Amino acid sequence: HHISMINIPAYGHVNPTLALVEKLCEKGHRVTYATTEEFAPAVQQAGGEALIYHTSLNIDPKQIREMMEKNDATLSLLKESLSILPQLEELYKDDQPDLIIYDFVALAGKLFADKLNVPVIKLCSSYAQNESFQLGNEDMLKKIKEAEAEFKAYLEQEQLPAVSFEQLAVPEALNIVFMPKSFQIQHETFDDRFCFVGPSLGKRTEQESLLIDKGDRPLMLISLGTAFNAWPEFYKMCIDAFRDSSWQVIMSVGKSIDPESLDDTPANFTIRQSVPQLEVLAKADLFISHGGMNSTMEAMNAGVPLVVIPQMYEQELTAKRVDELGLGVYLQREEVTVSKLQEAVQAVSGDQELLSRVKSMQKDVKEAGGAERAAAEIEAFMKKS
């Protein structure tokens, strides 16, 4: 059976799938992955055949911080669906797939699946959505009124057979979500076509030899993820906040920034562009994180409290949520100072009550499926559909 995974080129939107791809293959299913070259090694390691599309999205964190002019930045994902559909058509012309699985922003995978009337499962790598819970601000539901400005540029080259924008908000037969249903916002509103398996961890690209036995001293991880990590000011404040302190600190600065471009690295710090986050959290006593869903779930999967410094709306939702569920503290940026970094690491470390809350989220996130349940919910959907 040929399963075709369609996704954007983004670590946070593609890493959960890797563990999934490893399982489907272990079940004797050919899995093809429509990605760029940046991800073909990760996809190839899981067992997928990478099939490449030349892409229109930004990958380098520098390019994501600039092109923050916000001229309908949401449209990017639409235009990208319209660049990617033609190339998916060609990639699979004589390799039609039995099952298309597409990430919630890879609309190209929806259109492509419609156009071939092939079964389609939707992976939600962030919060899922439905008729009740539409995620987004006042200003981000009033931006899908400028999504319609481009939707009247849909009749400038081709046409829609009828209404086709209420069919991108609408969920599919099976919608796998990579958090536990408790952590989903408006959980109760989500019916049985949503399947909340929590974090989908497995093997990752071999990162550098970062052995870190630490000692009888506590270990803190610092990372703003893989896209909104282009903030030199923050990485200096962390060095100022925790140099030569109780804490052993491992800080990922992303690909936007030189570990030599900073102040000289304290004896207690390790500083890299990239760390093996799953390995570090196996030893971390605290994680200063940006509230990426992968990071938030990888933390809870390791029993690791959270200081959440969100960069984007999606991330502020996850940041409020972590506070509301008392799984750590919400520290806003443009409120982030060296004193405030210290106050929060203080307030979260040695709150035994808070630590017990994430120790039970550790259970609650593993009690959900994982990649195994998702691969079961997938194959079962294959037999049925």
Ligand X SMILES: O=c1ccn([C@@H]2O[C@H](COP(=O)(O)OP(=O)(O)O)[C@@H](O)[C@H]2O)c(=O)[nH]1
- Residues making up the annotated binding site for UDP are 15, 204, 226, 252, 275, 290, 294-295, 298
Instruction: Pick the binder of ligand X from 225, 303, 305, 328 (CB under 6 A).
Output: 225
Is the CB of residue 4 less than 8 Å from the CB of residue 103? no
How far is CA 68 from each of CA 71, 224, 228, 303, rounded to the nearest angstrom? Answer: 8, 17, 11, 34
Q: How far apart are CA 166 and CA 375, in angstroms?
A: 28
Q: Give the nearest distance from C-beta 119 to ligand X in angstroms.
A: 27
Instruction: Pick the binder of ligand X from 17, 32, 129, 294 (CB under 6 A).
Output: 294
Specify the amino acid at residue 207. Q
Q: Is 227 among the residues that bind ligand X (CB under 6 A)?
A: yes
Residue closer to ligand X, measured from CB, 36 or 277: 277
How far is CA 322 from each of CA 182, 185, 241, 305, 311, rounded to the nearest angstrom? Answer: 12, 11, 23, 10, 15
Q: Is 7 among the residues that bind ligand X (CB under 6 A)?
A: no
Residue closer to ligand X, measured from CB, 30 or 366: 366
Instruction: Pick the binder of ligand X from 17, 36, 129, 226 (CB under 6 A).
Output: 226
Residue closer to ligand X, measured from CB, 278 or 382: 278
User: Token pair of 283, please?
Assistant: 């030893």
Q: What's the start-to-end Cα distance of the chain, in Å?
A: 13
Q: Which residues of 120-154 are buried (b: 16+ CB within 10 A; e: fewer)?
A: bbbbbbbbbbbeeeeeeeeeeeebeeeeeeeeeee
Residue closer to ligand X, measured from CB, 32 or 318: 318
Instruction: Pick the binder of ligand X from 46, 277, 308, 310 (CB under 6 A).
Output: 277
Q: Give the nearest distance from C-beta 163 to ligand X in angstroms.
A: 32
The packing angle between helices 107-115 and 75-92, to 10°, is 40
Residue closer to ligand X, measured from CB, 99 or 275: 275
Q: Give the nearest distance from C-beta 55 to ligand X in angstroms.
A: 16
Return the DSSP state at 333.
T
361 burial class (0-12, 13-18, 19+ CB within 10 angstroms)? buried
Q: Is 259 among the residues that bind ligand X (CB under 6 A)?
A: no
Residue closer to ligand X, measured from CB, 81 or 294: 294
Instruction: Pick the binder of ligand X from 5, 7, 14, 15 (CB under 6 A).
Output: 15
Q: Is 295 among the residues that bind ligand X (CB under 6 A)?
A: yes
User: Does residue 121 sit in helix, strand or coil?
Assistant: strand
Span from 39-47, 150-158, 174-182, 288-296 in contact with ligand X (CB under 6 A) = 288-296
Q: How far apart are CA 52 and CA 55, in angstroms?
A: 9
Q: Give the nearest distance from C-beta 314 to ligand X in angstroms.
A: 9
* Site residues (vs ligand X, CB under 6 A): 11-12, 15, 204, 223, 225-228, 252, 274-275, 277, 292-295, 298
